[PDB]
Design a protein around this ligand. Structure first.
Ligand code: HPA
Ligand code: HPA
Lengths: 338, 338
DNA sequence: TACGCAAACGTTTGCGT
DNA sequence: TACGCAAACGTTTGCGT
């Protein structure tokens, strides 16, 4: 159809191209005519044709775990924002932690020839790790690892451990010694790593966490609900709880209130993520803020660089979690004695 | 590079193609050899090339308003799910209710030659309505209108009005007569239309809503926060409130609790949307459920049909909101007298 | 029987003059 | 000076035989 514009304007398609892309000087008169035709014919230059010659789709693929969850959604929206402002197209794909599902999206992606790949798979087993390598040719970066699990990628690291540690400390310095915890899946960084940072602070204080007091969550509110219950549903209960994710926390707040417990009057609660509306939780959730925006932007940028600047060597960039004091924590029994 | 496989297998690329796409019979021996080469060479057939000949990207574009908001996120995730199971690729784009931003994504989209277009722009002013028509050639459907604003599209309609009406009725039959309302933007369907359905029920009951009792929201929790405040922050206050969206409601729950008010003991609250975790609100939010999944799937399907079955004529499909009784509403003063 | 030739899809771009 | 020719990018597919 570019052919059709060239004719209507009586110029070569080469010309047409040049004016459309300002790739070389053209007579105004000529330039005009082209736009003229361009408009009447109602022209929309074909990207795929172009992509075919230039060799780049100017589109990036996001191999995500899921997009509904608050945590994720925010990250994603960050990424999309950046793509748009730098003219890239976002192809979103959720594998739900499913090998097949990943092998598929991964394949489709390579095929649609995405210029780069953003990865957020939560769990990374060897098998997944392998498929990924089969694509070391597509520039890509993973945004959810603790350390650098691999050499053929870029990685932005959250310091989830330093965060877990912050949370514990807070509780400690608040007067708490009987603390419980609902961690996220141990196969994730935000799971394992947050718990570890937490357990360090505990040990550093000679606080021991009774196993009856640590209940696995899955980041989903319901899991928070059940955990909380299980904890305060026992003879001896902690006076403070550290919840691996704000959304699970939201679920833990529900149960307490449902058992007639008072937060924080009866139970102090500290979360992790600092989701967009954790502030409007009841009560306003005190939590650890993960820089989701900076995490998105920072990944998109490494990707660009590798893309444009054709970087070959891996790179990792750390980001930093920080404490947000809201209203779900109260002084503990030992505040005064310190 | 298909050329490179044909050579390694000593067959024509035509052959190579045929085996890759099972488009015609091939000797096993031959078939094998092709796969053989296909693998060693580590082949990934180029989609863009293919798309270029066949004339279809097998990818759909989602021109959304925003993807962070719960309501939206869920819808989106629904759409994505369907795309994947029918082999389509999802290109996600947020215009944030910005004409330019829309004209851009719209353009990029046409250019990347998306097979179809899914639209969720919230507000549709004439200008936006016009740009859209410039693309009546791309098969597309809008998922957020009340009625059929246009002839060149398909439309799934939510019956938000029948929903608004349901909510009012509930409150009424619960014993309430002094009700307030925090509606969503009047320029949206889920805004205006929900309010209307509500106001009908009121009129049908000779209940009059004092203007001091209706405060505009923007679907964002903060707006809920402020509204609630403004309402219960006055001499004479309603005994029940109808909130246009669960997330705003979440914001209204926060304020009440912050003013030391009890929900529902002091104020009964009814929301709208039935977001994934409205159940884990405190208290568990009684609300109107919008079938988000069915809304996504139902749109993707109309789109497919128009796509594959090459349908030319518009079509609209209604979906139905329904009441979910949770724990934020209590009997009102007039329950017994009815 | 089972396969191959060559044109075409819509662009960009190296040389020209 | 300001522009045009033709090849190429990686596929599918109508005819062949
Ligand atoms: O994997 C996750 N899922 C949901 N919320 C989260 N917050 C941190 N990590 C996660
Ligand atoms: O436009 C909207 N935004 C957020 N939540 C909503 N729920 C219904 N409509 C909307």
């Amino acid at each position: 159809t570019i052919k059709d514009v060239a004719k209507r304007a009586n110029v070569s398609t080469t010309t047409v191209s040049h004016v459309i892309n300002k790739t070389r000087f053209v007579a105004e008169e000529t330039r005009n005519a082209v736009w003229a035709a361009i408009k009447e014919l109602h022209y929309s230059p074909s990207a795929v044709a172009r992509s075919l010659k230039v060799n780049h789709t100017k589109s990036i693929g996001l191999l995500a775990t899921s997009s509904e969850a608050a945590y994720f959604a925010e990250i994603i929206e960050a990424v999309e924002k950046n793509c748009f402002q730098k003219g890239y197209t976002l192809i979103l794909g959720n594998a739900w932690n499913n090998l097949e599902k990943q092998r598929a999206y991964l394949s489709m992606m390579a095929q649609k020839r995405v210029d780069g790949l953003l990865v957020m798979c939560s769990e990374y087993p060897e098998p997944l790790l392998a498929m990924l390598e089969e694509y070391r040719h597509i520039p890509m970066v993973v945004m959810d690892w603790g350390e650098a699990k691999a050499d053929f990628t870029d990685a932005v690291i959250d310091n989830a451990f330093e965060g877990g540690y912050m949370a514990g400390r807070y509780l400690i310095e608040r007067g708490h010694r009987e603390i419980g915890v609902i961690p996220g899946p141990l196969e994730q960084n935000t799971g394992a790593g947050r718990l570890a940072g937490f357990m360090k602070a505990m040990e550093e204080a000679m606080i021991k966490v009774p196993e009856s007091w640590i209940v696995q969550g899955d980041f989903e509110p319901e899991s928070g609900y059940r955990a909380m219950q299980q904890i305060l549903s026992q003879p001896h209960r902690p006076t403070a709880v550290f919840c691996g994710g704000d959304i699970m926390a939201m679920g833990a707040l529900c149960a307490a209130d449902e058992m007639g417990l008072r937060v924080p009057q009866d139970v102090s609660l500290i979360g992790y993520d600092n989701v967009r509306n954790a502030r409007y939780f009841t009560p306003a959730l005190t939590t650890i803020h993960q820089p989701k925006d900076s995490l998105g932007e920072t990944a998109f940028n490494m990707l660009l660089d590798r893309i444009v600047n054709k970087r070959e060597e891996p790179q990792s960039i750390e980001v930093h979690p920080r404490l947000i004091e809201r209203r779900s924590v109260a002084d503990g029994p030992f505040r005064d004695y310190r």
